């Protein structure tokens, strides 16, 4: 089987771990993976997908950067009789026959679990700064929606500052610096970061402001990357929800079934991770530091 995979980019360590996981799962399954990196631009994804259709691949997997603008290319794939699996983020389309299925976590559930954890931690008394993900990304929209739905139940919890950090470490840091300046000395209880990458940038801004991240300002997030588990083990951040980078597997199963002639296929197959905190961070970082450092030995190329 030849399968084209259109990846978003490399904005976070989570994302690059996802790319490495898909490549590793393809290899396990003897699949010829045409991997494309779009460098954060939807237009590059559309181009990759077009090329996959021109090359006559057996299936296409798309991790869509934003939700809009996919219908024309999906219709092209359909006319070409090439099944499409969506992974990670979502697309907004009016006809679900334009894809085979979607393999994803429940981002609203991720936002709900981390929000609940924070309310429990702070007994519902918490001024929060939000570092948002990229505009139009399902992961940002839905994590915000879920967190917001939990904190609406708690009158003494409120989001006092909210701005995009673009899912990146450098922009998370810059934004967090800005927040700390705008607070004008008023304590923040917590930072809610849509991903661990921005959260780790926030940690450095907090330190530079002479405050103790993980103690004075709580830091809660999503992804469960090893560097964040390390930070939790060190006391600098508090909690994250794990986001499995192994979505390729169920994507390849769905493709394998479709090619073998299976007709009955659900349109969404989903499982969501658990909240991890400092309580198990020493134990968990140990397990994760090698499932990690496999990737650190990989070879550099574009
Ligand atoms: O779509 C998943 C999100 O995108 C990545 O940028 C984040 O790290 C991850 O939570």
From TrEMBL:
Domain of life (superkingdom): Bacteria
Disulfide-linked positions: 126-189
Protein name: Periplasmic binding protein/LacI transcriptional regulator
Organism field: Shewanella sp. (strain ANA-3)
Lineage: Bacteria, Pseudomonadati, Pseudomonadota, Gammaproteobacteria, Alteromonadales
């Amino acid at each position: 089987t030849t399968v084209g995979f259109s990846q978003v980019g490399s904005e976070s360590g989570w994302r690059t771990s996802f790319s490495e996981a898909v490549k590793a799962e393809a290899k396990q399954r003897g699949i010829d993976l045409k991997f494309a990196d779009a460098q954060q631009k939807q237009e590059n994804q559309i181009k990759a997908v077009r090329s996959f259709i021109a090359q006559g691949v057996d299936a296409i997997i798309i991790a869509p950067v934003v939700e809009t603008g996919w219908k024309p290319v999906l219709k092209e794939a359909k006319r070409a009789k090439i099944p499409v699996v969506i992974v990670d983020r979502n697309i907004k389309v009016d006809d679900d026959s334009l894809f085979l299925t979607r393999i994803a976590s429940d981002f609203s559930e991720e936002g709900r679990k981390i929000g609940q954890w924070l309310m429990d931690k702070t007994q519902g008394n918490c001024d929060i700064a939000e570092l948002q993900g990229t505009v139009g990304a399902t992961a940002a929209i839905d994590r915000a929606a879920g967190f917001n739905q939990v904190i609406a139940n708690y009158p003494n919890a409120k989001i006092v500052r909210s701005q995009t950090g673009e899912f990146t470490r450098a922009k998370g840091k810059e934004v967090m610096e800005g927040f700390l300046k705008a607070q004008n000395g008023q304590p923040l209880c917590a930072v809610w970061s849509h991903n661990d990458e921005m959260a780790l940038g926030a940690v450095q801004a907090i330190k530079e402001a002479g405050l103790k991240p993980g103690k004075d300002i709580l830091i809660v997030s999503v992804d469960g990357v090893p560097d964040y588990f390390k930070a939790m083990a060190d006391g600098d951040v508090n909690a994250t929800v794990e986001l499995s980078p192994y979505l390729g597997g169920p994507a390849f199963d769905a493709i394998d079934a479709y090619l073998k002639g299976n007709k009955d296929q659900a349109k969404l197959i989903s499982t969501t991770g658990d909240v991890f905190t400092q309580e198990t961070a020493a134990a968990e970082y140990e397990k994760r530091r090698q499932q990690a450092a496999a990737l650190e030995h990989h070879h550099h190329h574009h």
